Structures are given as C-alpha cells and as structure tokens.
Symmetry: C2
Subunit: 1033 residues, 2 copies
C-alpha cells in the first residue's frame, strides 16, 4: 500500500501579504486550476491579488475557496512567496498562527534565515525551499530565481524609459538623423541576457560584457558587442556561480569600463557574488565619467550594488546622472510575476509527489548527481524541525564533464585534410594523361576516316548530353526516363537498313531484323504516350490555354520538304540526321523549365519522325517491301499504344524496366543480323576487324541489359522475392564470367570460319544473360532504383555501339545523349544517399563514411497522441511542411493528403511539401504521384531548398518515412546510415509521425519534441481528413 | 489589452470614441491612453490633467 495520504484531505493555503510593498502573488486563478486539478484542497484569503490585478472571484470560480486568514495558513499546506515573519496585521509571528505539521514552500534563504529556521523548528513543520533549487536540467521547469531575473530585467529595461530624455531606437527621417543609444549591460547572468533581449528588441545598441566566458558567448549570441579586458586571467566561477580572479583582471576591467563609460549612456548593473556582497565595478569618478543625462540602474539593489554611490529604494539625481535605485523592480510587475511563480510552483509540485490522491514526497539523502532525489533533499530543508539545510555534495558526476560528440562533417573534413596538395594535382594529371593516351589508343586502331568522324561526333554529342541533363528541374526527372526510353526505340533504324527481300523475309537475317524493328516500335509509341500522359498532370488549372496543335507546322514542313527533296532528285539524309539529332537534344533541353515542357515532347516526336522517314527514304524500297515495314512498325505501335493507357502511374517502373529489356533484345538481334548479312564481305574491308569487335561489344552490352532488365521487372513487380538472395561463391563466379567475356574475344579473330564465328558470337549472349542474372538478383529492393538507371545507361551505350557498326550519325548522337542521362541520374541518386556505386552493385555494407563497428544506441521516451490532440495541434499552426514518403503514396493514400492541403490552404495557412530524392522507386516518382493527387507544383519543394526553411515553421507532418528523416545520419559516426543528407526536421517544434506501432530505430522516435500517433496511414490520414472537414465547417 | 486614443479633429472638439461602460468593459488592469488630452479626449470619462 502507498503511504501517501489522500490529496482531498490535503489543503493548500494562500494567505495575505504582510511584508511592506509585497505586491506579487504566489498562486493565480490559473494557478488555482492545477493542484486542485491534481487533488489538493484550496482555501484563499480575502486580499491576495488586488494589487496584482487578480480578483478573488476569479480564484473562487477557479477552484479556490474563500476562507479566513488565521485558518488559511493553518491548513495542511501554507503557500507564501516569502518566509513567515512578525505579522503586524495580527501582532504575532506568522509561524505562530499556522498548524503544527504544515507544508512550506516559499522564499526562505535559511543561511540568512537562521532565526526563521529556529521559529520554524519550534513549530515542527516541514519546509521545502524554493530558493535552494539547484541549477538542474530536470529542475528547469522550476527556476524561480531565473524567472524573477527575467521579469526584473524586462522591468528594468522598461524603467530605462521615463528616465532617459532621448528616443531609444532612433530613425533617420527627413528632419534630422536620430542617433541610437548605447546601453551597457554590466554583468550578464540571466537578467543580463533578458534585458539585452529587451533592449535589442527596443532598438538600442547593447555592448554588455561579463567575466564569465559563457556569458560573453551568450551576449554575442543575443547580438551585443562583447567587450574585452587586457588581463586575460582564468575565468573563475565553476559550478554555476562567479568567483574572484586576480586584481590585474579587476583593474583591466575597471579601466575598460571607465573607457566605455565615456562611450555609453545607459548603465545596467546585474552582477552579484553568490553569498557575498556585490563587487564594486563603478567608483565615484568611474561613475562620473559618463555624460550628463545618463542613467545607472543596478539590479543588485538588495545586496548593495556595483556602483559606489547607490541609494537603495530611491530615484536620486546626484548631480545629473540619475542613479535609478528602486529596490523592488520585479514586485511592480505582479501579474506576470505571479504567473511565473504559479508556473514554477506547478512544475515543482508535479515532480514533488507524483501520485493522484496520495502524497509522501520521501526525499533520498544518497546524494546522486542529476537525480531528483538529491534535488528534493536540497529542496526539503526542514522536516518537522529536522533541518536539512547543510547539505552534502552529490556522489555522482552528472552534467560535469565535456564529452560532446564530433559530427561526421568534421570527419569528412579530416578525410579531405589528410590529402597533401601534391596528391590532388598528381591524381588530376594522372587522369588527364590516361585520357590523352586513350585518345591516341583510339587513334592507332583506326582503319579509315569514317571511324574518326564517328568518334568526333560521338564525343561532342557526349558532352552535349552531359551538359544538358544537369539542366532539368528535379521535379521533372520522372518524365525524363520515359523520354529517353521513347528515343531509345531508334534502333528500328538499325532494323530498317537491314530488313530486306520482299513482303516476307527471304533470308534469316531479314527475319531477325524484322523481329528487331517489331519489338522496337513498341518503345517509341509507349514512351511518347506515357510522356504526354505524364506532362498533362503537372498542369495547373489556372494557367492560360496552351495550344499544342500548331507544332504540326514545323513537323509538317520538315517531312514535307524532305519528301519534296526526295521527289526532286536530292539527298538530305546526312543533314536529316543532324536535324533529328538536334531535335532529340532539344527534347531533353527544352524540358528544363517546367513551363515549356510540352515543346520538349513535340521536338522528340519531330525527331523520331524525321529520323525514321530519312532512313526509310535513304535505301529506295520497292513498293511491296515497304508494306512489311509499315505493317511491322504499325503492329508494334498498336501494342505499345494500347498498353500504355491502361496502367496507373504508380505502376510505372515495371513498364520502364520492360522497355529497357526490349531495347537490349533489339540491339542483340540487329547485331547478330548485321554479322550474318556481312559475312561474305570479309576480304575487301579495312574496317572488318573493327566492325567484328564492335559487334562483339554490342552483343555483350545488349545481353546484360536484357537479362538484368527482366530480373529487375521481376523483383519490382513482386514475382520474385524482394530479399537479396545469396550465392555461395559469387565473386569468383562474376569474375569468371567477366573474364570469359574478355577471353572470348581472343579466338574471335584468327579464324574467319562462319561456323566457328557465329557459334562463338552467339555464346556471348548466354554469358551476358547469366552474369546479368547473377548481378541483378543479389541487390536488394531498398536501394533499388540505381539499378533501374544503370540499365538505362546500358541501353544508351548499346545504341552507341550500334551506331559505330552501321555507320550512322543519328544513332551515335542519341546513344551518347541517352547514356549520359542514365549515368547522371544514377550519380544524382548515389549522391542522394552516400553509398558509392561499387558498394551497391557487387555487394557491400553500410555507407562510405562509417567505419569500425558498434552502431550506437540512443535512449529516450515516447509521446503518444490521439487524433483529437493531433487536430488540436494542427488547427493553430500557420506554416506547415509535409514530408510524404513512398508508403504514403503507394498505399493509395495520397488523395486525403491532397484535399487536406486543398482545405487548409484556403484558411490562411502555408502548406508546403518537402521531397527527398530516394523517396520512391524511380528518380522523381514522388513529384508525379503528388501531381496525380491534384497538388499544384508551387508548393512542392526539393531537399536542398526546404532544408533551411524549417526553423521558422510551426508544424511538420512526417508521414511514412524512416531513412530520410533519421537523426543518426548527421551526429553519430558509428551508425549504419551515417553521412547521408537528410531533412533537418528536428529544428521545428511539433512533429507528427504516423506509422504502424513502434521501432536501429530512429532517434526522432524518442526525441521528446516529437508528438507521434499510431495506425495505418490510410486510416489515420482519412480519419484526419474527416475531422478536418467536420471541424471547420 | 492596451488602448491608445489619439483621435482629434483640428479646430473642433475631439469626438468621444470610448463610452462609459465600454471603457470598463476591459479586464481589471486595462490601459487607456488619451492622446487628445488638450483637445478634450476620445473617452466618455477622461480628466485631462492627471493619471
Ligand atoms: C533546329 C531546331 C533545334 C531545336 C533544339 C535546339 C537546342 O539544342 O536547344 C537547346 C538550347 C536551349 O536551352 P536553354 O539554354 O534555353 O536551357 C537552359 C539550360 N541550362 C540551365 C543548363 C543553361 O539551345 C541551344 O543551345 C541553341 C544553340 C544553337 C543551336 C543551333 C542549331 C545548331 C547549330 C547550327 C547548325 C547549322 C548551321
Ligand atoms: C507524319 C509525321 C508527324 C510528326 C509530328 C507528329 C506530332 C508531333 C507533336 C505535335 C504536338 C502535340 O503533341 O500536340 C498535342 C496533341 C493534342 O494533345 P493534347 O495536348 O490536347 O492532350 C490530349 C492527350 N491525348 C491525345 C492522349 C488525349 O496531340 C497530338 O497531336 C497527337 C498526340 C501525341 C502523340 C502521342 C502518340 C505518339 C505516337 C508516335 C509519334 C510518332 C513517332 C514516329
Ligand atoms: C569517363 C569520364 C566521365 C566524366 C568525367 C567526370 C565528371 O565530369 O565528373 C563531374 C561530375 C560530378 O558533378 P559535379 O559535382 O562536378 O557538378 C555538380 C554540378 N551542379 C552543382 C550544377 C549540380 O561527375 C558526374 O556527375 C559523374 C557522372 C558523369 C556522367 C558520366 C559520363 C558521361 C559522358 C560520357 C563520355 C564518353 C562518351
Ligand atoms: C562513366 C565514368 C563515371 C566516373 C564518375 C566519377 C565521379 C566522381 O568524381 O565521383 C567522386 C565521388 C566522391 O564522393 P564525394 O561525395 O566526395 O563527391 C565529391 C564530388 N566531386 C568529385 C565533384 C568533388 O564518388 C561518389 O560519390 C561515388 C559514386 C561515383 C560514381 C557514380 C556513378 C557514375 C556513373 C556510372 C555509370 C554506370 C556504368 C556504365 C557502364 C557502361 C559500360 C559500357
């Protein structure tokens, strides 16, 4: 059984004021709400807050009861703001009118109240000391000296006015420049910082300084000019106080204060030696060194003051410089003073005896540092006459040693600083000499000038492709992958110059080329459909009507002039390849604006149209051969047109990974077909060995693309199991397959036998497929999309190796243009996280900045919230940032977020979204899913610009995301996910987290400013939708 | 919580912009500032020479 008696039997008491000029109160009506809410009875006297602007009817309706005065202090608890003294209202001591076993919590100072301690021991009452609460972090709810200092500092900066005859701020208007004032904050504790904040809000120039080193840091952090002395002694006052240094520092500070005393006009003295008199920091002439009209007010008016001339309680002029020396400054602000006193008393009593209708408050005398038991023993100074005033020091050492962490930004600064300036230039020069000898190595094996021309246009198109896909706005990456897949179907150009015979194929190579163009028209039709279905979802309704049907003028005159030049006896196809290549470049370039995106699709359609028309006109087909080409491409367009209108946008990466498999299959097929049709010409060709090698390389690339793409489709769709399956010997096996791909090229010369050549050329697709299965199955779906972009790079380089084989500029230009886009998407998403590519592909652990072992645990507590306290905390806020995740949008739960934004933005809030580049399974999927929901793109930000627009935000709604909102990434170098850039969400105030139940777990889950809730994100989200609609309407 | 009355028409009397019970309709601890003190005042009760 608990030995704490019922709080309904416990009676608190608020008596009247017997001290002279005692105007503050101990308990408010809002202070009368709690602790009668927690359980104690409340009996109040007649006159308690009439000077404090608190009527007794407000306390009577707040829960307190009207009682007498002799029976008010003689209750189970007596509450005053000061100690009991000789009450001249009753004519006896106030300790002689209370009960025997009372409860005392007031200003005591029993080292200065020894006779009051004797009078309390004669009454045999238990006394807790409000003044003896030590400076603890758990006691930060109840710091009465700090709140009294803050209120006195605000009242002192207030009383600066009506004493100074000049304006405080000062402006330069068109009547004369008003110079701002210079205020000297002599002595910075807490009241120094409070009065400095009040003056900096008022507009003055504050130049406060103090002996404590942390006080100088806080004064500069508030914005003062930290004055310094020459004698830089050791900063005394360890343990939360101030001690005396040598007389050299005292004389240097005296000279510095006398020098700045001719410079400032406002003198605020707030220094106090703990338990001793105030240190004299202003002498007679040192105070007389100020100008006339100055004011010197000292906040240490009780224990003397830092001025040698100070009248304690007056407003003496004293030859001009009016020394403001009233002693009760904070007593004149009794409203906020009584409010802070009631708040401190409530935060003390909330931990003093935490039991409903039970109260013992048994103190521990074991003296553990940081413990509330030792803080309670220091608070409880008397127990029925047993004095606990002389207290022993704490046995533990909590909050006493500087062992603070060092961030991972410092460790990457160290790994950048471990490189001498020789090795930077040495590595750069080594890269450049390797590149230049590689250019000469490509020069040596050149058979003719055609290959040199193709290398030159390949390199220049590669630099255009590198430079133009950094340009795209990161909200439009998800159409970029579909645009590059739509352009990737230009390997039908690789089919059409091979496709021959009649309306049915004669030889087998014509059949393979027919298969290639058939499964390559699918890419073109499906890619441009998903592109324009996707760009028509970023359209705001309140935009002007974009007419796009007038782009048939350039396309119409382009192919019309081409056909007229065909029926005029001309040849434009080498320039038509330039036209289609530059239109394909302008497809990616024109979509870098978000405003001109529809031109960036129209140029792609013009480019593919002109390219296929040019290649089709450039081989002179007989009018029955053309029917098969038109029929095959039309059937492929029919299939690709009718599949890419019956899928929702959430199922897009399956489609994109199918399109890459088709590009790889087409490349392998047209490579083998061109090798078969060009076998009887292996005598009279200088480039025969070169085209043989380029065939081998294109076969390898296309096969790896094919197999890895269909396995990636299988792992995304849910067909294969999403866990990263293992093979026992993988690294010897992958090294063996790669070395077999290298070693196959050696018997591929030295024998021009078609029977050997085709059987060692078709045995490369198999090796490529096996290594693609081996290097795609063991990846892991959490870091998936880097392997959906590396396959895009592989498809582009397959087109590049096609263009080197068929001697065609269009293919090489769009091949470099697609390959660089894929590699740049993989780089921007590898640097979205911090894992390198080689650690992803062939398996790895952790990041590239973690090292060693032992990922650190972080403790902390929980904060549960229902739906009603969630909407109660939302309904006030005026600046909300939402960071939705993939578990939001792929759980069919983005429509309630959409109309929640729609309903909150029309009431005056500022709702913005915040997007991270790996939230999703495609680069930029989350932008298009939020635009599918119906959200305008003016409120969707990305990471690099929302990240320093968190600290001035009321409210953050974190919805279904773990790794992009971790806090272990920045501060803990032991962690698994360390060094990853991450949304700084923990510089806001209230963080709603919505996930299933509980938790290495995220430290935001335990950080106490987080107010999380529970449930399924669909259910929590749409329940909050219904409450938002039924709350305001 | 704070109320400052600075309304005055030059040449004529300032209109009383505060009533007798509407001035007491604030909380106990109100501040009523009458900056039209020489030209009467914008309150129904304002002695112009003392606080
Ligand atoms: C023909 C129509 C081509 C349409 C596409 C042009 C293009 O590349 O636009 C992209 C860009 C427009 O993109 P942009 O510069 O507006 O996009 C901004 C991108 N960042 C932010 C990265 C800077 O246009 C050019 O670069 C034009 C350069 C001249 C090209 C003229 C044609 C080729 C040269 C003449 C050959 C014959 C003589
Ligand atoms: C003969 C060669 C013709 C070449 C030029 C073809 C048109 C180029 C683009 C014209 C501008 C445009 O998109 O206008 C929007 C207009 C109107 O679109 P909208 O902007 O009104 O949006 C409606 C969207 N749909 C059509 C889905 C309901 O669209 C068109 O003119 C046609 C639709 C775009 C093409 C989609 C399928 C592509 C198939 C392969 C294309 C050729 C590959 C070879
Ligand atoms: C092989 C050479 C690769 C390119 C050289 C490295 C490089 O440019 O690094 C800078 C960049 C690093 O970027 P960065 O950090 O220098 O630039 C950042 C620019 N802003 C701030 C505007 C975002 O490297 C990459 O991005 C790596 C991939 C580059 C693309 C891959 C090659 C494409 C071209 C193919 C050439 C052959 C045909
Ligand atoms: C292509 C060549 C790519 C070289 C990239 C070098 C970028 C760099 O400097 O990174 C340093 C950074 C070092 O990390 P960092 O965070 O210190 O970045 C410093 C950035 N710079 C160099 C600009 C100061 O490396 C990484 O961040 C790791 C990832 C780099 C590689 C990312 C992918 C590159 C493209 C791969 C394409 C796929 C293969 C295609 C195969 C085709 C076969 C036919």
């Amino acid at each position: 059984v608990k030995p704490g008696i019922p709080y309904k039997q416990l009676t608190v008491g608020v008596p009247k004021e017997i001290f002279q000029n005692e105007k503050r109160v101990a308990l408010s009506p809002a202070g009368v709400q709690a602790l009668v809410k927690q359980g104690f009875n409340v009996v109040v006297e007649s006159g308690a807050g009439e000077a404090s602007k608190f009527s007794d009817d407000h306390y009577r309706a707040a829960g307190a009861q009207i009682q007498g005065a002799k029976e008010v202090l003689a209750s189970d608890l007596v509450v005053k703001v000061r100690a009991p003294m000789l009450n001249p209202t009753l004519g006896i001591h106030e300790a002689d009118l209370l009960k025997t076993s009372g409860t005392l919590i007031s200003f005591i100072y029993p080292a200065q109240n020894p006779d009051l301690l004797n009078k309390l021991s004669k009454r045999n009452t238990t006394v807790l000391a409000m003044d003896q609460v030590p400076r603890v972090t758990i006691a930060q709810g109840y710091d009465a000296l700090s709140s009294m200092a803050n209120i006195a500092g605000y009242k002192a900066v207030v009383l600066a006015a009506n004493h100074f005859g000049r304006f405080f701020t000062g402006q330069i208007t068109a009547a004369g420049k008003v110079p701002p004032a210079k205020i000297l904050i002599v002595g910075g504790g807490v009241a120094g910082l409070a009065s400095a904040g009040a003056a900096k809000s008022m507009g003055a120039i504050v130049r406060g300084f103090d002996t404590r080193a942390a006080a100088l840091e806080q004064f500069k952090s508030l914005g003062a000019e930290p004055l310094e002395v020459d004698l830089k002694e050791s900063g005394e006052g360890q343990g939360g106080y101030a001690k005396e240094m040598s007389k050299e520092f005292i004389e240097a500070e005296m000279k510095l204060f006398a020098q700045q005393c001719k410079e400032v006009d406002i003198l605020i003295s707030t220094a106090l030696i703990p338990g001793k008199k105030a240190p004299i920091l202003f002498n007679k002439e040192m105070i007389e060194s100020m100008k006339e009209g100055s004011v010197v007010v000292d906040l240490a008016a009780e224990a003397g003051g830092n001025f040698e001339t100070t009248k304690p309680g007056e407003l003496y002029v004293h030859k001009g410089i009016t020394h403001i020396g009233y002693t009760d400054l904070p007593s004149r602000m009794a409203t906020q003073a009584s409010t802070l006193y009631s708040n401190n008393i409530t935060k003390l009593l909330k931990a003093i005896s935490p039991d409903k209708d039970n109260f013992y408050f048994e103190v521990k005398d074991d003296f553990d540092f940081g413990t509330m038991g030792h803080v309670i023993r220091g608070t409880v100074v008397m127990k029925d006459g047993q004095v606990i005033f002389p207290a022993p020091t704490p046995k533990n050492i909590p909050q006493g040693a500087p062992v603070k962490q060092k961030t991972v930004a410092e460790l990457e600064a160290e790994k950048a600083a471990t490189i001498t300036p020789f090795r930077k230039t040495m590595t750069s020069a080594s890269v450049y000499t390797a590149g230049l000898t590689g250019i000469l190595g490509l020069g040596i094996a050149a058979p003719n000038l055609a290959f040199s021309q193709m290398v030159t246009t390949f390199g220049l198109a590669g630099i255009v492709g590198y430079h133009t896909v950094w340009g795209v706005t990161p909200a439009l990456h998800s159409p970029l992958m579909s645009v590059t897949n739509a352009i990737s179907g230009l390997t039908a150009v690789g089919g059409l110059v091979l496709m021959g015979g009649h309306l049915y194929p004669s030889t087998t190579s014509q059949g393979l080329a027919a298969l290639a163009t058939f499964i390559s028209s699918v890419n073109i039709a499906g890619g441009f459909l998903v592109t324009q279905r996707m760009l028509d979802m970023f359209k705001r309704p309140t935009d002007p009507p974009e007419y796009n049907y007038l782009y048939l003028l350039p396309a119409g005159t382009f192919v019309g002039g081409y056909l007229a030049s065909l029926y005029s006896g001309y040849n434009i196809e080498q320039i038509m390849y330039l036209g289609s290549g530059l239109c394909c470049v302008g497809a990616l370039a024109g979509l870098s604006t978000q405003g001109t995106a529809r031109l960036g699709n129209a140029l792609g359609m013009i480019g593919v149209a002109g390219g296929l028309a040019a290649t089709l006109g450039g081989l002179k087909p007989c009018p029955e051969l053309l029917a098969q080409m038109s029929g095959a491409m039309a059937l492929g367009g029919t299939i690709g047109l009718t599949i890419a209108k019956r899928i929702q946008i959430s199922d897009l990466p399956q489609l994109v990974a199918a399109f890459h498999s088709l590009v790889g299959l087409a490349a392998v097929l047209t490579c083998i077909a061109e090798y078969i049709i060009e076998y009887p010409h292996f005598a009279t060709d200088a480039a025969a060995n070169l085209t043989k090698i380029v065939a081998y390389l294109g076969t390898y690339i296309g096969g790896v693309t094919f197999s890895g793409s269909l396995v990636a489709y299988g792992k995304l769709q849910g067909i294969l199991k999403s866990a990263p399956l293992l093979l026992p010997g993988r690294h010897l096996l992958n090294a063996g397959l790669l070395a077999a791909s290298v070693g196959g090229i050696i018997p591929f010369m030295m024998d021009p036998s078609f029977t050997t050549g085709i059987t060692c050329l078709g045995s490369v697709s198999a090796l490529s497929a096996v290594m693609g299965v081996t290097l795609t199955a063991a990846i892991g779906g959490a870091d998936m999309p880097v392997v959906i972009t590396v396959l895009n790079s592989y498809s582009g380089w397959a087109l590049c190796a096609e263009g080197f084989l068929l001697n065609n500029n269009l293919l090489t230009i769009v091949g470099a243009l697609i390959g660089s886009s894929g590699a740049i998407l993989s780089y921007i998403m590898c640097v979205a996280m911090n894992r390198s590519l080689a650690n992803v592909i062939l398996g790895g652990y952790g990041t590239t900045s973690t090292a060693g072992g032992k990922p650190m645990e972080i403790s902390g507590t929980h904060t549960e919230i229902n739906l009603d306290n969630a909407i109660d905390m939302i309904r006030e806020a005026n600046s909300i940032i939402i960071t939705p995740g993939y578990g939001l949008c792929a759980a069919k739960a983005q429509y309630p977020i959409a109309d929640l934004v729609k309903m909150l933005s029309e009431q005056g809030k500022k709702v913005r979204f915040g997007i991270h580049p790996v939230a999703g399974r495609m680069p930029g999927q989350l932008n298009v899913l939020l635009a599918e929901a119906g959200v305008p793109y003016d409120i969707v930000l990305e990471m690099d610009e929302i990240n320093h627009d968190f600290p001035d935000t009321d409210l953050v709604l974190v919805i279904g995301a773990n790794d992009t909102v971790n806090s272990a990434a920045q501060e803990d170098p032991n962690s698994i996910i360390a060094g990853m850039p991450v949304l700084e969400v923990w510089k806001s105030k209230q963080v709603i987290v919505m996930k299933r139940s509980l938790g290495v777990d995220n430290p935001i889950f335990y950080k106490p400013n987080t107010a999380m809730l529970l449930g399924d994100a669909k259910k929590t989200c749409d329940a909050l939708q219904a409450k938002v609609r039924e709350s305001y309407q």
